[PDB]
Write a protein that holds these residues in place. Structure first.
Motif, PDB file in Angstrom:
ATOM      1  N   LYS A 196       0.827  -1.201   0.000  1.00  0.00           N
ATOM      2  CA  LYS A 196       0.000   0.000   0.000  1.00  0.00           C
ATOM      3  C   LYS A 196       0.865   1.257   0.000  1.00  0.00           C
ATOM      4  O   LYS A 196       1.641   1.488   0.928  1.00  0.00           O
ATOM      5  CB  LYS A 196      -0.926   0.006   1.218  1.00  0.00           C
ATOM      6  CG  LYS A 196      -1.893  -1.165   1.252  1.00  0.00           C
ATOM      7  CD  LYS A 196      -3.335  -0.702   1.130  1.00  0.00           C
ATOM      8  CE  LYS A 196      -3.735  -0.505  -0.325  1.00  0.00           C
ATOM      9  NZ  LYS A 196      -3.938  -1.803  -1.025  1.00  0.00           N
ATOM     10  N   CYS A 197       0.726   2.066  -1.045  1.00  0.00           N
ATOM     11  CA  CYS A 197       1.495   3.299  -1.165  1.00  0.00           C
ATOM     12  C   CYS A 197       0.572   4.512  -1.204  1.00  0.00           C
ATOM     13  O   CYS A 197       0.361   5.129  -2.249  1.00  0.00           O
ATOM     14  CB  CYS A 197       2.364   3.262  -2.422  1.00  0.00           C
ATOM     15  SG  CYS A 197       1.476   2.775  -3.920  1.00  0.00           S
ATOM     16  N   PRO A 198       0.006   4.865  -0.041  1.00  0.00           N
ATOM     17  CA  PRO A 198      -0.905   6.007   0.084  1.00  0.00           C
ATOM     18  C   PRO A 198      -0.187   7.342  -0.084  1.00  0.00           C
ATOM     19  O   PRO A 198      -0.666   8.232  -0.788  1.00  0.00           O
ATOM     20  CB  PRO A 198      -1.454   5.870   1.506  1.00  0.00           C
ATOM     21  CG  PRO A 198      -0.405   5.112   2.245  1.00  0.00           C
ATOM     22  CD  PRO A 198       0.212   4.176   1.244  1.00  0.00           C
ATOM     23  N   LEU A 199       0.964   7.474   0.566  1.00  0.00           N
ATOM     24  CA  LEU A 199       1.749   8.702   0.488  1.00  0.00           C
ATOM     25  C   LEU A 199       3.097   8.445  -0.179  1.00  0.00           C
ATOM     26  O   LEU A 199       3.289   8.757  -1.354  1.00  0.00           O
ATOM     27  CB  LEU A 199       1.962   9.284   1.886  1.00  0.00           C
ATOM     28  CG  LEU A 199       1.335   8.502   3.041  1.00  0.00           C
ATOM     29  CD1 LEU A 199       1.941   8.931   4.368  1.00  0.00           C
ATOM     30  CD2 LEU A 199      -0.175   8.692   3.056  1.00  0.00           C
ATOM     31  N   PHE A 200       4.027   7.873   0.578  1.00  0.00           N
ATOM     32  CA  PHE A 200       5.357   7.572   0.061  1.00  0.00           C
ATOM     33  C   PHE A 200       5.668   6.085   0.194  1.00  0.00           C
ATOM     34  O   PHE A 200       6.230   5.644   1.196  1.00  0.00           O
ATOM     35  CB  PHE A 200       6.413   8.395   0.802  1.00  0.00           C
ATOM     36  CG  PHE A 200       5.900   9.037   2.060  1.00  0.00           C
ATOM     37  CD1 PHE A 200       5.915   8.347   3.261  1.00  0.00           C
ATOM     38  CD2 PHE A 200       5.402  10.329   2.039  1.00  0.00           C
ATOM     39  CE1 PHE A 200       5.444   8.935   4.420  1.00  0.00           C
ATOM     40  CE2 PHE A 200       4.930  10.923   3.195  1.00  0.00           C
ATOM     41  CZ  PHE A 200       4.950  10.224   4.387  1.00  0.00           C
ATOM     42  N   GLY A 201       5.298   5.315  -0.825  1.00  0.00           N
ATOM     43  CA  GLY A 201       5.546   3.885  -0.803  1.00  0.00           C
ATOM     44  C   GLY A 201       6.945   3.532  -1.268  1.00  0.00           C
ATOM     45  O   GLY A 201       7.386   2.392  -1.123  1.00  0.00           O
TER      46      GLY A 201
END
Length: 16
Positions: A8-13
């Motif tokens: 999961k890369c919501p912001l900085f994955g």
């Protein structure tokens, strides 16, 4: 910082 990065890369994955 986030239990879910690699997958999961919501912001900085990239630099999770």
């Amino acid at each position: 910082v986030a239990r879910g990065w690699k997958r999961k890369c919501p912001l900085f994955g990239k630099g999770g």
